[PDB]
Design a protein around this ligand. Structure first.
Ligand SMILES: *C(=O)c1ccc(NC(=N)N)cc1
Ligand SMILES: [Ca+2]
Length: 223
């Protein structure tokens, strides 16, 4: 997160850390056994870490559950990042509590101007490298499709939306990818890509979650 604030331990209970010997992407707990993340976070050997604040210290409240399968969306395209969505099945169910909870899927897409919360343990530096220990947060509005497109001509599909600030100085960045964009309580976006981090006129681009509700439900119901 570039330009965000420390969230406060356990205040974003659906936030997960994808780990393979170090934190590499986030995700969101959408139920006791399934996490949604980005298809580009895919790798084998993933341990899902729930209930984390400081990712370098065991402080209590943590649940380390391995991934039992990851399902990249079948039309995910790595050159464009269209369909940049993946579902992870946990090997056992998580203990949901006040520090580990799931986030609702949307029933409709969010409109421009909606304010959302992006969270992640990604880089905090726009020009440079600085990973945080604790979770960072950033409030950011969904931008109009007009503006999203005029910033990334020819690269925005109908499965993406831009959110953030055109001025620069506030955006998601490397290591935030996979994590959530929550709006009025629902999961509307997945941290997917952008040009640089926090650069003016180059907002963050997000997987459009509402277009995937039926796929998720169907996929989960048969796995
Ligand atoms: C994911 O790690 C990721 C997503 C988005 C960006 N760029 C911007 N938000 N500008 C970087 C890395
Ligand atoms: Ca920890």
């Amino acid at each position: 997160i570039v330009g965000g604030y420390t969230c406060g331990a356990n205040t974003v209970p659906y936030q997960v850390s994808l780990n393979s010997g170090y934190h590499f992407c986030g995700g969101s707990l959408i139920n006791s056994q399934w996490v949604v993340s980005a298809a580009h976070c895919y790798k084998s050997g993933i341990q899902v870490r729930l209930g984390e604040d400081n990712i370098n210290v065991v402080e209590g409240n943590e649940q380390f559950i391995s991934a039992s399968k990851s399902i990249v969306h079948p039309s995910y395209n790595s050159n464009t990042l269209n369909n940049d969505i993946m579902l992870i099945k946990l090997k056992s169910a998580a203990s949901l509590n006040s520090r580990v909870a799931s986030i609702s899927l949307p029933t409709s897409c969010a409109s421009a101007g909606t304010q959302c919360l992006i969270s992640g343990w990604g880089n905090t530096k726009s020009s440079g490298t600085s990973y945080p220990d604790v979770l960072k947060c950033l409030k950011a509005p969904i931008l109009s499709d007009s503006s999203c497109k005029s910033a990334y001509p020819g690269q925005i599909t109908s499965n993406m939306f831009c959110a953030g600030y055109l001025e620069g100085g506030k955006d998601s960045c490397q290591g935030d990818s996979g994590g959530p964009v929550v709006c009025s309580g629902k999961l509307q976006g997945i941290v997917s890509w952008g040009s640089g981090c926090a650069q003016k006129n180059k907002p963050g681009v997000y997987t459009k979650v509402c277009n995937y509700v039926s796929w998720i439900k169907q996929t989960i119901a048969s796995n």
